Amino acid sequence: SLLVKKYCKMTTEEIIRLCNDFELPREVAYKIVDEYNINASRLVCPWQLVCGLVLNCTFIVFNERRRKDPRIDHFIVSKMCSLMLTSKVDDVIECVKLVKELIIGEKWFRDLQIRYDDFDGIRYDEIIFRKLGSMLQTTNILVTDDQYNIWKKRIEMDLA
DNA sequence: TACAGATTTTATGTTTAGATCTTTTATGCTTGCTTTTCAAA
């Protein structure tokens, strides 16, 4: 288990290797590098911080693919347990929640949230009406128009 | 204007809501010594 190993040694090359197996953009990868570098002397297990950083960035960058396909959300963490050498998935989401405290309110995290238009899993135009307590907020008990359209196209493909 | 009746004026008592100051006690800061877990060899 890579999350158990205390005071371990790592370089930026391993960080780029982890960030290139998730196909993140390069600026986000160097911001992950800088975020590890400004905390590197004070982590009991730096792989905990790195795991939370890449998981929180890969939730944000592919928010549209996660919206149109939830199984990607069941893929990515299921892939990353293969890289942290852990069988249970609870420590990975614990890493996500523990790192989430340390980067919320940071300027680059907020700019990433703005430019991908992703604030805790939804766009601004939905979160403003859930914050206002609107009765007309787009609740999710039906399916969206894009999901309905791609499902209708897929079922018309498999009909003939 | 005459006068009964209503309202005001002046005068005081009853009860509650709150302000200020005094006395005693809690509380936090400082400084010097002692124990204890965790980062590193």
UniProtKB/Swiss-Prot annotation:
**Assembly and partners?**
Component of the origin recognition complex (ORC) composed of at least ORC1, ORC2, ORC3, ORC4, ORC5 and ORC6. Interacts with ORC3, ORC5 and TAH11.
Would you identify the family this protein belongs to, as annotated?
A: Belongs to the ORC6 family.
Miscellaneous note, as given in the UniProt record, is: Present with 2970 molecules/cell in log phase SD medium.
Q: List the disulfide bonds.
A: none
**Name under which the protein is recorded:** Origin recognition complex subunit 6
Q: What residues of the intact protein does this structure contain?
A: 271 to 430 of 435
Location(s) in or outside the cell: Nucleus
Origin species: Saccharomyces cerevisiae (strain ATCC 204508 / S288c)
**Its function?**
Component of the origin recognition complex (ORC) that binds origins of replication. It has a role in both chromosomal replication and mating type transcriptional silencing. Binds to the ARS consensus sequence (ACS) of origins of replication.
